[PDB]
Every structure is written in C-alpha cells, then in structure tokens.
C-alpha cells in the first residue's frame, strides 16, 4: 500500500493515523471481495511495487573474449578484466596475486567469487587497483572480479552471488571524527 | 444429642480422599459454615456486624447489576457491520 503521506498528497488533504487505517482496511476488504479487473484497476492506484547488470563481452585484438568491470571499497578502486577462458592466473598491477597480496586473507578474498561459482582455474584475470589499505584493496578487487565474472556465469549463478553478497557494494565506510569526541563515537573520557 | 456421622459426612469414592475432602469443604463453604467459624473466632461488635452486612448487600447488588449490564451490552461487540463509515 501507499504510505499515509503518499495518500495525503494524493488527496491534497490532511488525514490522521486512524483515517489512514480506516482507508487501508476498506481497501483490504475490497481486495478480499474477489475484486475483478474493473476494481483491481482502481485498487492498483493505491498499490506500490517493491538484478545485476550483465556487462557486454568484449573482444581483444586476438579475438579472445573478456568482460571488464569495476568496483570500489573504502578508498580503494579496482578495475578487473576477466577472460572467458583462462588458467586461473590473476595478475594484479602487473604482479602475481600471491606476490602482491602477501596475506592469505586477501588471497581468500580474491578466491571467494570464483570459488563460489566453482570457476577457479577457468578464468584469467587482470586487476588494476589503486588507493586505500590492503584490506580495502582486497575488497575492491573482489567486488570487481565478481562483477566481471557475472557476465560469464549464468543468470541463476549471478543471482546466487548477489544473494551471497559478492555483488553487493559495501556501504560500510569510515565514519568521520566528530568535534569534541576522540572518535566517530568515542566520547572523551568523561571528566568529573 | 443428634445421631453421629449423619451430619457433614461424605463417603469417599474409590478412596480419592482428596476429592472427597474437596467436596466436603465445598459443601461447608456453600452452607457458610466456614464463614461462621472464622467470623466467630473473634467477636464482631453489633455495630460492625450491621455495617459489614449493609456493605456486603450493597456490593452484591452492585456486582449483580454490573454483571447484568455487561452481559446485556456484550452482544454489541460483534464486528462492525458498517465498516468504512
């Protein structure tokens, strides 16, 4: 249903909570009363409705197919090109992934999407990352790789990844320090 | 000077002495004997007894009227037959 403010704007009138409840309950009864098309059309005037984009598969000069995508985490940005076919090589900033990320946690982050879709060793990846710390860079590269792999994995696989969280951009970012308190929430030691 | 065991006697059924005792106590309360015993443990002065009896009668009648009114008006609790208006 449209919210009470929506209904108030529709009726250019000022209602109350109980008025909205009465209207909504009457509408619900109208639904339950086998509302036909002639009535469902009127009802839908008060209803309110509540997928990852598949990037094009481009081709190189040699005709090898690939998909390019991008993603940002904290302050890091990553552009990932994933090839339709590959032996699992993942070169980051022209560097091998294991060398560039000396932390097995970051390696696991890189592996997460391809492991999830069971496509490890089936794609060669080139990831250019910039900015932020090591974990932010790992997250950005993971997001970019997942998005690029979407184009190559089936739609059901894409939906599964999105449900898992691979394909959802992280909204968690550092919260700015506030004046008069040490941290974003750390209130200075309460004097007495 | 009366016969024994004829007054306030209940025969236990199948040995459920608990149930028989509960029935006997219910009988005593219904006839008010427990009221009399616990009230006669001490002496209520006639003025206090009169006040208490008047208060009890007033409360009984008030409760009867309130219950009758509630029963009479309960029928209107049915779901609204003109909802939306």
Curated annotation (Swiss-Prot), chain A:
Subcellular location, record wording: Mitochondrion
Region: Disordered, residue numbers: 171-192
Modification N6-acetyllysine occurs at: 84
Assigned protein family: Belongs to the universal ribosomal protein uS9 family.
The protein's assembly and partners: Component of the mitochondrial small ribosomal subunit (mt-SSU). Mature mammalian 55S mitochondrial ribosomes consist of a small (28S) and a large (39S) subunit. The 28S small subunit contains a 12S ribosomal RNA (12S mt-rRNA) and 30 different proteins. The 39S large subunit contains a 16S rRNA (16S mt-rRNA), a copy of mitochondrial valine transfer RNA (mt-tRNA(Val)), which plays an integral structural role, and 52 different proteins.
Protein name, as recorded: Small ribosomal subunit protein uS9m
Species of provenance: Homo sapiens
Lineage: Eukaryota, Metazoa, Chordata, Craniata, Vertebrata
Residue window of the full protein shown: 199 to 395 of 396
Curated annotation (Swiss-Prot), chain B:
Gene Ontology BP terms: mitochondrial translation; translation
Superkingdom to which the source organism belongs: Eukaryota
Chief place of localization: mitochondrion
Keywords annotated in UniProt: Mitochondrion, Ribonucleoprotein, Ribosomal protein
GO MF annotation: an example: RNA binding
GO terms under cellular component: mitochondrial inner membrane; mitochondrial small ribosomal subunit; mitochondrion
Record Pfam families: Ribosomal_S21
Matches recorded under InterPro entries: Ribosomal_bS21, Ribosomal_bS21_sf
Signal peptide: none
Compartments reported by the entry: Mitochondrion
Family as reported in the entry's similarity comment: Belongs to the bacterial ribosomal protein bS21 family.
Subunit (UniProt): Component of the mitochondrial small ribosomal subunit (mt-SSU). Mature mammalian 55S mitochondrial ribosomes consist of a small (28S) and a large (39S) subunit. The 28S small subunit contains a 12S ribosomal RNA (12S mt-rRNA) and 30 different proteins. The 39S large subunit contains a 16S rRNA (16S mt-rRNA), a copy of mitochondrial valine transfer RNA (mt-tRNA(Val)), which plays an integral structural role, and 52 different proteins.
Name used for this protein in its record: Small ribosomal subunit protein bS21m
Source species taxonomy: Eukaryota, Metazoa, Chordata, Craniata, Vertebrata
